[model samples]
Target chain A: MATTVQDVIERLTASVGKIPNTMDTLQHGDPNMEVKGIATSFMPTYRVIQQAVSMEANLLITHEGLFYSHTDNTEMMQKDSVYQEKIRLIRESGIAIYRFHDYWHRHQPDGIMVGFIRALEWESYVSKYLPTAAIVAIPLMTAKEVAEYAKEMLSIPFVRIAGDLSAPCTRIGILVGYRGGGALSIPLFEQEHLDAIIYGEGPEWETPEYIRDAVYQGRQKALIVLGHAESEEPGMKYLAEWLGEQFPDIPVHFLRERPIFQVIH
Target chain B: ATTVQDVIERLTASVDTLQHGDPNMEVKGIATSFMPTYRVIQQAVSMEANLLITHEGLFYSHTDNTEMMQKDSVYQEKIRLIRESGIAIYRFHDYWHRHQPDGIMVGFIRALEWESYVSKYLPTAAIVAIPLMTAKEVAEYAKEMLSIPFVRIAGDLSAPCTRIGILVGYRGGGALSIPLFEQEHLDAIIYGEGPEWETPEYIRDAVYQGRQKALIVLGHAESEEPGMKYLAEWLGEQFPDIPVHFLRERPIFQVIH
Candidate 1:
């Protein structure tokens, strides 16, 4: 019923082979890393990590970096001891962390994309069995319907809307998972081709300017934001479920990290 | 005999300024990027660009860690990228930021026709704008003026932007944005991504302070891409034969669905 720290590490390391970048990043200082329990999340932010330990999920598995960039690099490693200390806290909390970035991204035939499909409740939309056919259908929902559905479904407080809401949306392109910046905006735009999109955080200028420009250009598009972490954690939870059948008896937990903010009136 | 020093001095002499910290950083070769990143090192090395002139960052930090003390995945990846490229990364931060008259801000601002609106000697709050526009209009202006197609706005787009402030060179969430917002310098400030808390708090306080204002974030690369392209054009004016390339070095576009 219980898997020890060594047990999870051995299983994961053996299961995946090489320890991923996150594993190394988190465990850089903690040599005697072990796993009392495992938590899966979009990121391992400070508060998110605290919840994991609170839930008795000491080993943290994440998709994004503990640090800012994709590589989990601590810019303040030298100027401040915060980086080393955070790692220390994770270790002291009896948490060993690892990231499933490239490996998970490489999931064939349907990647993390499939999980989002379910989360977005778009299962009724597609016939992905046709590989050569690259199209995403949403079974005839209007853009307004999709936006409201997303704003409610994801429990987002509010999402900015662009394009005509009245436009019918049967074929939608989903570009989920991100922290999009200025440079990559267009490519994501070209790919989604949907009436609207749902994503993690992107730059404010990139965010508003982008949609506004798209509007100016008389193109049809919309963006639903789930902040950086909110948009991403759910798919990782979905991932934990996939692992359930694959890694049975491993006591997989979709240990979502905390959303690091306290709302005030 | 044409030597490297001659080329460097020539480069320094031809350009308006060697404002870049590592104007002397070895020039391996050249490539284009939305922002400079380690992955592009391969492209640099392949093209025999040993000395890199990256627009953004090398070590995923503000400046590449001079001390080999960094150990995270990015540090490791960057080390590999730099060594593999067999080049040094000299960031063009301050120099590029300090473009006189036609600064990076100029490229972004002029496109919006806010020419009469910018500060001549900034931090003094001399030249400013009170033209009321919604946060939505501000974002739209950026898209139109700057050519960014999908800006990710976080505040009340309908809220008016009576005052405007712009920030550049923020890689991390714009930590410095709040102070200006605090200074009552402007009703709304535009920059690359501000930390989430910063966004909400700025908007909230801007309201609590009896001001209905907003913040429009331009993702770092998106905000800077046009400016650098502007810089590259200026560089072309200076270095006609050497060729000034606008390398797209920032985020590579990807879609999940």
Candidate 2:
């Protein structure tokens, strides 16, 4: 029997007793159509979807919202060429995009944070915490060392740092999506006694500057900045794995999104 | 008997300068400001400083895109007020940068007590070394000495560094600044300003990749004001007869709680 996009969404929603799948709603394409294979990615970038098409995967599950917003509201993007092309591509390719943001983050141990820690091989050091805020303490190394390991492990091209480079840091905090505001991280920084923080992305004005000031005040702190896409890509990888286990009859593949921005120097 | 025209013409003759206001206005007094912010302009008006030498633009945009600002009510009001008050504003950007040692660069290095470390041939961007201190210390030192309200820094804060680079203005983004870090091995870059997405992001990535480089982004106005402050002193020396004063612009921003 062919599993439709509706079938997968229904299964996902039914697993949770009362919790809603706010983002599981279809973002693009027909929901009633039968799914061939499913491709999961952190973001449904043009190239990733194209790869999905080549793989004969019509259902694309994204961890982040599509169309450049939190809610994926298309009101502002309706006239934009990029948005129009993406819609056209989805419609023509018969690809259905279902965002797995809020629920995926709500899952046990957090799907994104879990993937990130596992990617860094820090799964052994994971401590109890919220999905947004997680902490890990391993053998002590300078802040720069952690950055190097993170870059090499994740295959990320660049990592931004703020704080003591030579400062010996053992306790590190992880927050994948800190982009909306910097203020949220202040109390988080204070509460964790973290020697360093590895974040997906933070506005230059907020968390980065706060750490800059904190270090200036003679506090031990460092910040390792990871690209927004790279930080969350692991969760989508985890999603692919989880989906495969759940739907053994359907093939589930993880489509990696290349880092959206690159460093020139 | 130096009119505003004479002072501007003199500055231009000595070093190419750009004028953004009425050139022929009579000069009673001269006010040098790092940025001609609305508040700074208001102060310049109150001081009856008929000739204003501004380090940054009077109208918004890099080149003062006068055509675009023509319809802007704020621009219109400022233009009208400057005309009504007979104040002639001249932008001192290019010429100031072209000054013998780049006025802003010289003043900034001097402000940090690193003047001796600055190179004579290097005008705008130069590598200098100070007593070894953590990158964190260097950043805090700048905030304290430069009177900068907030500073953005990237790279290992505890990394020991002494070598510093001074690039004290928004010069076509981070083209000039990032190179100094990459090529010259500058431990830290003291820049007037940068778009956060560019150099800051680059430094952030560099640090994440385990580079020891650090960046200190001082607010544009705060970074350049020292040179204009120095300009006031030099102008006082040049035109002894004219009443010259520095309208010290405040750090235009603060970190709210």
Candidate 3:
């Protein structure tokens, strides 16, 4: 039988104990539309949506949001010309966008976290605790040493940082995506004695600031900020691979949108 | 020697056009602020500072396009308050950025006492190298000098840094900052305001996998307030007849208990 968007959702929904409040929601387009192919991306930027169309994808699964906000609420964008145009283009392409946030995070072994750990090639070195947070112990190394390793391995060009670079660290925590900012691990920093917390993104105000003060006070703590896209894009890639394996007949692809802009000194 | 209108006329002579408020308003006193936050406008009104020189826009965008917010109650209230107070809210973003040596960059450099270290500068990003000081010391110095209560930091706090990249105002995005990190080979990057996802995240990952770098995040208002303060002094010299006040939009956020 030919797969449809509904079929994909039905498979995912059945695997889970219950429908999570956060995930597997068809954010845009029709669920009944037959799937020509499936595409997954960390974010559903217009370019990715268009790329999906080029690949003959009728279903685009996103880890984050479609509209500007978390809930994909377009009510406020009634007069927003850009928003209207984006929706118009998406509809014209016959592509359905589905958000896989809560469920993906709630997925057994946690999809985003597992994908990120694998991306960094730290699976052998990491231990999962919170669905998204990880406690990994490796040979003690400076924050700078580990940071460079991650940049090269993940193919992320630039990463933001705070805390002590030369400070020796072994215990590490990983929070993939913006969830690191909201459900931050300060207690993990203090109690668990985590040397560095690698996360997708965080407000400059919270965790980074905390690490700053802590390191200032002579505490050995470090923070590595992978841009949101850089952090979570791997999980979507893994999702694409997993989907490919699950549906042998369906064409599944990962659409990666690299950092929007590059920095020049 | 000149009214606010006359002063603005001369200021805008070299650069682009102004965003909001009238250039015709006669000036009694001047208040320069990072942004015309509600409290800043109120203080300006109370202090009889009729000329509000805002570094950012009044209506929450670059163009100060009120067409979208025309029906917005908060927007209407903001306009009404400024109009009621007879305050000329002129957004001084582009013109100020184009100012010699970059007005904001210079102010930030001076605020951190890094005047001697700034070797090269741009409108958005600047390069400064100071005596070998730990990142903690540099951050503390910034906090104290700028009178800011809190400063967010990344990288090795104890990491010794002399070469620094400083981005004043809301210019702390990966597009701007990452290039600086890539090219500058600087020990630390300091910025005014950045969304967490951009430079902060990039730097975080850089440090985790082991890059010798740090980021100091100052609040947007705090970072650019010095520029506005510098504007007060510059405007004071230009128009000696008008009383110019550097309205301290003092690091508005307080760490709640």
Candidate 4:
């Protein structure tokens, strides 16, 4: 029997438990369409859509919204050329797109965070897990050393660092996605006695400024900023792996895109 | 009227408060800048400007909390510099922003020569009916007018837009600016920095949806510096006898390409 898009989504929703008013929804194509191949990505960028089409993936599971906004509101762009082109491509390819954000994050132990933690090789060091952050007690290392380790492990060319680079750090706070903001990540320093925080992007003025001041104040606090995509892509990649295990008969591909930014200098 | 405390009293009653040095110290000269960076502080001292009025925090953080920096060498050096120079730093944030139409907006509008184009002023932003121009044109005009080397543009660059929302400081976030576009029917938004994932991403989507929308990001300091510069002029007028100087800093970021 051929598996429909709805069947795969049903299996996912069933596994993750019922989520009321979830952001996960079919963004494009018919839900009843039969699945041929499955492709997962952090974002359904135009290029990713094209790549998925070439790979004959009839279903694209993206972590972020298909458009740009988190909610993926398309009320204003009804006549946009870029929007029309992207949608036309999806329609032509007969690919169904689904945003797998809220439910995946809602998964027990957080499906996204678990994958990210595994990528960092900090699963064994995890001391505590909060709704938005994780605390890990790793062996003592300088902030610079930790930043380098993250670059090597994540296979990213670079990462931004704030606070004293030479600061001795052991108790590390891990916040993925936009949870690096001050309200979520700052208080963890004192509350958890964290020595360093490694997080995805937030406002430059928030936790980064806090870390700057903390370091200026002689506190052994440091911050490592992994670009939002760089940090969360692993989770979506892991999702491809998990989905593969779930459907051994189906072809599941994790589409890896180039780094979102290029350092000009 | 001669003391820094008296000068502050004449300005406005606000959450803006003295950040460093004695409020009772007599005013010598006033130096105004967007931030009290070390270089700006040194410039104030060299000019014998004992009273330094700054828009942002003396320290890196907004709250200027010094509880943790008691033993840090950088903090110690900065404090030492302030002490030895006898420069009193007064943060003029709340009072300036509290001005009836928002002092920052007024100065920003003046800088852009958009005074006549202003349609209305909201609590944290302004609406302007600028002469019809493409988003790219507006961005270029802003860079030229503000003397900024570059400004980041998101959304449809070629889209022609006249109704623009102007948000200064960190008010460019999605929660505040995105809805304004819908309510005000704004074709574009020009704002200071906010989290990148917010309004910019919204505009990106809006553009993709074929909306004639745009977002122009003026760096936080770039957007607000004109206001601090205008404050110097206003302060000079308020206290004509005091030497009020507006100190300008180099752009915070260097674009490699």
Query: Tens-digit lDDT track for model 4 on A1-265?
Result: 8888998898777767767887798988898998889999987877788889999989999988765567655664464455567667777877999989888887777778888899988899999888888889999899888998888888986777777778898999988888887667766777798889988877665676556655545678789888788788889989999998888778999997665433312
DockQ of each: 0.04, 0.03, 0.04, 0.16
What is the alpha-carbon lDDT for the whole of candidate 3?
0.72
Q: In terms of DockQ, which candidate is stronger, 1 or 4?
A: 4
Q: In model 3, what is the error at residue B122, expressed in angstroms?
A: 26
User: Alpha-carbon interface RMSD of model 2?
Assistant: 14.1
List the candidates ranked by TM-score, beginning with the highest: 4, 3, 2, 1
TM-score of each: 0.51, 0.54, 0.56, 0.71
> A154, model 2: CA deviation in Å?
0.5
Q: Specify the CAPRI tier of model 1.
A: incorrect
- Clashing pairs in model 4, backbone N/Cα/C closer than 3 A: A77-B209, A77-B210, A80-B210, A217-B69
Candidate 2 segments whose C-alpha is farther than 4 A from its true place: A14-23, A71-78, B1-257
How do all the candidates rank in terms of lDDT, highest first? 4, 3, 2, 1
Candidate 2 residue-pair clash tally: 9
Looking at candidate 4, what is the lDDT of residue B249? 74
Please state how well chain A of candidate 1 matches the true chain A, as a TM-score. Answer: 0.73
Model 2: per-residue Cα lDDT over B128-155, one tens digit each: 8778988778888888887765665665
lDDT of 1 by residue, B118-138 (tens): 655353122347577887787
Worst 10 residues of 1 chain B by lDDT: B248-257
